[PDB]
Amino acid sequence: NECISVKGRIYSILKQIGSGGSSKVFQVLNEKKQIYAIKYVNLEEADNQTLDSYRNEIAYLNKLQQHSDKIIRLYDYEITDQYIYMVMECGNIDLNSWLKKKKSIDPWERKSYWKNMLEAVHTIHQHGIVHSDLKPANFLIVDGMLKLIDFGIANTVNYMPPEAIKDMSKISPKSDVWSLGCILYYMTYGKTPFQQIINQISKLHAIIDPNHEIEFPDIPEKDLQDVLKCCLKRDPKQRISIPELLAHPYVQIQ
Ligand SMILES: C[C@@H](Oc1cc(C(=O)N(C)C)ccc1Nc1nc(O[C@H]2CC[C@@](C)(O)CC2)c2c(Cl)c[nH]c2n1)C(F)(F)F
C-alpha cells in the first residue's frame, strides 16, 4: 500500500493504469473507501512551453467542470515545481481499449455514446477550444456514460481530418467533427473509413483525395448513414456542424 497525500488527504495506491513515464495514472482508495484516478506528472525535466501547456490544460479542465458532466471530474490537485497530482474520477475503461475488444455494439449504446461525445466536444468549442486530434483514447467510459479526458492542449492517422493534413492556419471546429465522425463510423462498420488503406503516405493521400469515395454500406438506421455521410465531407464548409448534429434525427427521434 504505497500512499499519496493531496491537499491533506491520503490515498492508498491500488495499481497503475497503463504505463507512461513522465506521467503516470494510478487507481487509488481514500479514507471513505471511494476509488479515484490520480494522475502524476513529473516536472523535474520540463521546459517552460511544456509547463505552460500543462498549466493551460489544468485551467480549462478546472473551468469546464461546471459546464458539462461529460468532461471528467477533477476533485483536487497539487502543483509544485517538481510535480503535479490530480485527483480525478475513475473511468471503467477507455473507449479505444473497449472498441478493440467488442465485436458489435447495441445501437442504443452507440447513439447514447454519440450524444455524450457531442455534448463534450460542443462544450469545449463553446470556450474557444478545438481539440484537432480526437481519437477513441480521448474518451473514458464511466458507468455507461462517455466522458472526455483531454482537451488536446497539453504537450493512428485514421481519425485525422483533411484540414490537419493540408496544414502539415486551417483547423476549425469542423475538424473535430470529422474525427468524431470517424469514431462513429467504426462504431457502425467495425473499421475507420480508411483502415484498409495500408501505407501511412497512402492513408493521408486518401483522406484529402476528392476522388476517393468513402464506402457507406446500407444499414437499418438510415439516419445514422446520413450523419456519417455529413460528418465525413472533405470540405469543412460543406461539413455538418455540432449544433446541427445535436438537432439531427439520429440524435432526436427514436
Ligand atoms: C478501473 C480501471 O480503469 C481503467 C482501465 C483502463 C484499461 O482497461 N486499460 C487502460 C487497458 C483504462 C482506463 C481506466 N480508467 C481510467 N483511466 C485513466 O487514464 C488512463 C491512463 C492510461 C491511458 C492509456 O491513457 C488511458 C487512460 C483515467 C484518468 Cl487520466 C482519469 N480517470 C481515469 N480512469 C482500472 F484500471 F483502474 F482498474
- Residue with the three cell numbers 461529460: 70
Catalytic residues: 133
Experimentally determined by: X-ray
Structural contact between residues 242 and 131, judged by C-beta atoms closer than 8 angstroms: no
| Same domain (yes/no): 81, 152 | no
Check whether residue 82 and residue 100 sit in a common domain: no
| Beta strands 74-79; 83-88: pairing state | antiparallel
Distance 186 CA to ligand 1 centre (A): 21
Listing from the earlier edge strand, what are the strands of the sheet with 9-16?
3-6, 9-16, 23-29, 35-42, 83-88, 74-79
> Is there a single domain that holds both residue 80 and residue 205?
no
Instruction: Indicate if 57 and 123 belong to the same structural domain.
Output: no
Task: Kindly provide the b/e burial profile for residues 15-49, where b requires at least 16 CB atoms within 10 angstroms of the residue's own CB.
Answer: eebeeeeeeebbbbeeeeeeebbbbbbeeeebeee
Question: Which of 68, 92, 116 marks a domain boundary?
Answer: 92
Q: For ligand 1, say whether the CB of 27 is within 6 Å of any of its atoms.
A: yes
DSSP β-bridge partners for residue 111: none
25 marked ligand binding residue? yes
What CATH number did the domain enclosing 240 receive? 1.10.510.10
Beta strand pairing status for 146-148 and 35-42?
unpaired
Find out whether the beta carbon of 163 lies less than 6 Å from any atom of ligand 1. no
Which mutation among 6, 11, 16, 17 tests ligand 1's pocket best, with the greatest number of atoms within 8 A of CB? 17
141 and 164 in contact (C-beta within 8 Å)? no
Residues constituting the chain: 254
Q: Quick check: helix, strand or coil at residue 86?
A: strand
Query: Do 130 and 190 reside in the same domain of the chain?
Result: yes
Which residue matches cell numbers 471503467?
92
- From the CB of 183, is ligand 1 less than 6 Å away? no
Measured distance CA(146)–CA(17) in Å, rounded: 18
Amino acid 44 reads: E
With a 6 A CB cut-off, is 231 part of the ligand 1 pocket? no
Residue minimizing CA distance to atom 17 of ligand 1: 91
Same domain, 195 and 148: yes
Do residue 85 and residue 173 come from a single domain?
no
Decide which of 49, 76, 92 is a domain's last residue: 92
The domain tally of the chain equals 2
**Residue range(s) defining the domain that contains residue 25:** 4-92
